[PDB]
Scaffold this active site. Structure first.
Site, mmCIF file in Angstrom:
data_model
loop_
_atom_site.group_PDB
_atom_site.id
_atom_site.type_symbol
_atom_site.label_atom_id
_atom_site.label_comp_id
_atom_site.label_asym_id
_atom_site.label_seq_id
_atom_site.Cartn_x
_atom_site.Cartn_y
_atom_site.Cartn_z
ATOM 1 C CG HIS A 37 -0.753 0.191 2.475
ATOM 2 N ND1 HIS A 37 -0.058 1.298 2.918
ATOM 3 C CD2 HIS A 37 -1.031 -0.541 3.584
ATOM 4 C CE1 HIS A 37 0.111 1.220 4.228
ATOM 5 N NE2 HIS A 37 -0.471 0.112 4.656
ATOM 6 N N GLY A 39 2.466 6.692 10.033
ATOM 7 C CA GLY A 39 3.852 6.484 9.625
ATOM 8 C C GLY A 39 4.507 5.261 10.241
ATOM 9 C CB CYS A 54 2.479 1.257 7.541
ATOM 10 S SG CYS A 54 0.731 1.413 7.938
#
Lengths: 306, 306
Positions: free
Chosen positions: B41, B143, B145
């Site tokens: 993603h 932030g 991920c």
């Protein structure tokens, strides 16, 4: 979202951990530049510990009485001195993994990460608060002495704790990195016990602000309190008195949430008087006191879930 | 003595953390050998995320669409593929800090350490359990991920989690290191919510053994139970059914303490039925389910405080 007891990443500290052996005792030391720091009670046998004279026990040792192992490398001791309750062993090699560091003496209520080590090998990491009674509720087994406490500030390690002993109640005592004990404790086998403790008021309040920041307002009320009236309730519940300095410290968190410190104190006073009614705050059924205002700012979003 | 949620020392993992940027999205990646792993993603904008076709979005990218930064070093992408919900970026440099590692898919109830990272910089470390409903109750902000979960087994890092999303209730979802989600979750913006959860029975029991090992016996009783009768109480209290496999797993702890598993189950059944009576177990006022039998053996003394 979420809220957990979070330790600092431990890598910078891992690269400084060594094994120190003197006679038949092994424990952990801290290797920064060309110096290894460890508890002085490494020179004691099982009987010395009852009434040791460290000056007298130490004069009897040479540089080669001390064996220092960094991994599978032996480090040669080329000097030694005592600094309060610490030994300092000068070694022939300077640690190439030495981070930028400071030695700091932490205040009661302040938090730090502990890297639990055995035989110079890191085994675990967890967050601790220095209690008002100068102990920590760590998790330590035999061979954990010399394990360090620390905070990390950008790239700089602030070392604040070295582990020396367990007390009768299973709580832990140690020194700063100059060898000065936290609390009235000594490095010998005595009847010494932890003094009575209190709850860290400022930290409970910080953690209530975190709950609001994370979206929860259920415990708030329409009331306010004066410092003095809050402090009457605080002493009944064995909480630390709140001070104007503590009110000032909570300023930034107060502004982020739009809740006045003394209004939050009324909420706390109500929580203390009425209990929590089967409900939880940040997943907890009790009032948590091991996060500082700094820990809350570090971990929480800068923007609140209004 | 003592008992704390303990994370693995995080250093070996810190040396593998990078920043990955594609267009306007930055998140964290995992750099092992000459491959950087990250959530796919990373290729999505704010609208793609609503109905993304990753095959279609990816064919539109080149090797130089991806910017990888290890500290102050830029790494050149020389290849890229998608593996389930992960991107794999082949880079021109092999990570010199690569530990011995494995990729493992963890089972529900199992624990691991999370190294929370932002912009490729580690910020915190904490211990998590994979819930029965395939979520984790982490602490993550925007932030985060690509932050990983792991266990350490001697010198070997077993990576088990990569962070992808937050769900409506503030709990977290992600994948193993092959890109396969834990749970029925997908990497797109939907109405997806965490299924209902249950308490991890085996872990509560493990933690009761830890309490006994550490010296506390107050919650024991003169009773025993059958599996089937325990399980009737378990479903009333939204606990996982106990199985014979779980009884077998508790064997070593049962032998160390001299308390039969089913006798400990009667204790638990009583705790569930009667509450805890203002008392605490290992400092806790609730029954903790985020320690495995393995976590108890790891942390506790091999010898019990009889």
């Amino acid at each position: 979202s979420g809220f957990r007891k979070m330790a600092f990443p431990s890598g910078k500290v891992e690269g400084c951990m060594v094994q120190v052996t003197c006679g038949t005792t092994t424990l952990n030391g801290l290797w920064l530049d060309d110096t290894v720091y460890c508890p002085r009670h490494v020179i004691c046998t099982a009987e010395d510990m009852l009434n040791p004279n460290y000056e007298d026990l130490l004069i009897r040792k040479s540089n080669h009485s001390f064996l220092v192992q960094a991994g599978n490398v032996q480090l040669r001791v080329i000097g030694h001195s005592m600094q309060n309750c610490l030994l300092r062993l000068k070694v022939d090699t300077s640690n190439p993994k030495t981070p930028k560091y400071k030695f700091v003496r932490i205040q009661p209520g302040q938090t730090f990460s502990v890297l639990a080590c055995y035989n110079g090998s890191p085994s675990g990491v967890y967050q601790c608060a220095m209690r008002p009674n100068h102990t920590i509720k760590g998790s330590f087994l035999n061979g954990s002495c010399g394990s360090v406490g620390f905070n990390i500030d950008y790239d700089c390690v602030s070392f604040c704790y070295m582990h020396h002993m367990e007390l009768p109640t299973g709580v832990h005592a140690g020194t700063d990195l100059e060898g000065k004990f936290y609390g009235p404790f000594v490095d010998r086998q005595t009847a010494q016990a932890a003094g009575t403790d209190t709850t860290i008021t400022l930290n409970v309040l910080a953690w209530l602000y975190a709950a609001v920041i994370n979206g929860d307002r259920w415990f708030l009320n329409r009331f306010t309190t004066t410092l003095n009236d809050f402090n009457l309730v605080a002493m009944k519940y064995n909480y630390e008195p709140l001070t104007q300095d503590h009110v000032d410290i909570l300023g930034p968190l107060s502004a982020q949430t739009g809740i006045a410190v003394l209004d939050m104190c009324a909420a706390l006073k109500e929580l203390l008087q009425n209990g929590m009614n089967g409900r939880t705050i940040l997943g907890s059924t009790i009032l948590e006191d091991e996060f500082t205002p700094f820990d809350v700012v570090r971990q929480c979003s800068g923007v609140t879930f209004q």
